Amino acid sequence: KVFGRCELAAAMKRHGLDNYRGYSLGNWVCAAKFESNFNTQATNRNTDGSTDYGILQINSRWWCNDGRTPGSRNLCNIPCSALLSSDITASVNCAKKIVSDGNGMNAWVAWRNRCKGTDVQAWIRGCRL
Ligand SMILES: [Cl-]
Ligand SMILES: [Cl-]
Ligand SMILES: [Cl-]
Ligand SMILES: [Cl-]
Ligand SMILES: [Cl-]
Ligand SMILES: [Cl-]
Ligand SMILES: [Cl-]
Ligand SMILES: [Cl-]
Ligand SMILES: [Cl-]
Ligand SMILES: [Cl-]
Ligand code: NA
Numbered sequence: 001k002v003f004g005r006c007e008l009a010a011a012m013k014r015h016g017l018d019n020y021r022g023y024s025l026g027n028w029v030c031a032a033k034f035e036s037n038f039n040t041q042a043t044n045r046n047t048d049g050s051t052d053y054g055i056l057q058i059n060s061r062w063w064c065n066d067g068r069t070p071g072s073r074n075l076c077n078i079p080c081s082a083l084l085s086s087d088i089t090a091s092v093n094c095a096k097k098i099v100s101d102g103n104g105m106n107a108w109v110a111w112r113n114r115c116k117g118t119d120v121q122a123w124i125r126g127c128r129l
Pocket of ligand 1: 024025026027120121122124
């Protein structure tokens with residue numbers, strides 16, 4: 001599913017991401033924009049052999065099982081394919097664990113490089129939320 005911007009903001013908000021670990025909703029929308037272009041089916045191989053999955057590009061080295069990432073863990077206790085669903089529940093539950101791991105949203109390199117410190121409120125402008 002390719003979410004619209006406000007459509008994703010509303011779903012993330014409903015799932016409790018707004019101000020989760022202190023990160024406002026626009027941070028999460030910005031991260032999803034640059035991680036997946038709001039496409040739940042996005043997948044991208046990393047150089048280490050892991051793969052990132054779904055709207056928030058959650059990686060298989062630590063967070064989900066894809067059966068092809070040697071030495072990796074599955075700390076969200078889910079198959080990585082569950083992160084590609086139209087329904088973002090699994091991705092959000094897993095993202096909550098990631099952003100709690102110690103470095104906050106810096107875990108998403110694209111957030112650090114493209115969203116951190118910017119006017120992230122713009123990502124929720126116009127939305128009836
Ligand atoms: Cl915001
Ligand atoms: Cl881009
Ligand atoms: Cl894909
Ligand atoms: Cl992989
Ligand atoms: Cl995801
Ligand atoms: Cl594996
Ligand atoms: Cl393969
Ligand atoms: Cl393994
Ligand atoms: Cl999803
Ligand atoms: Cl933080
Ligand atoms: Na894994």
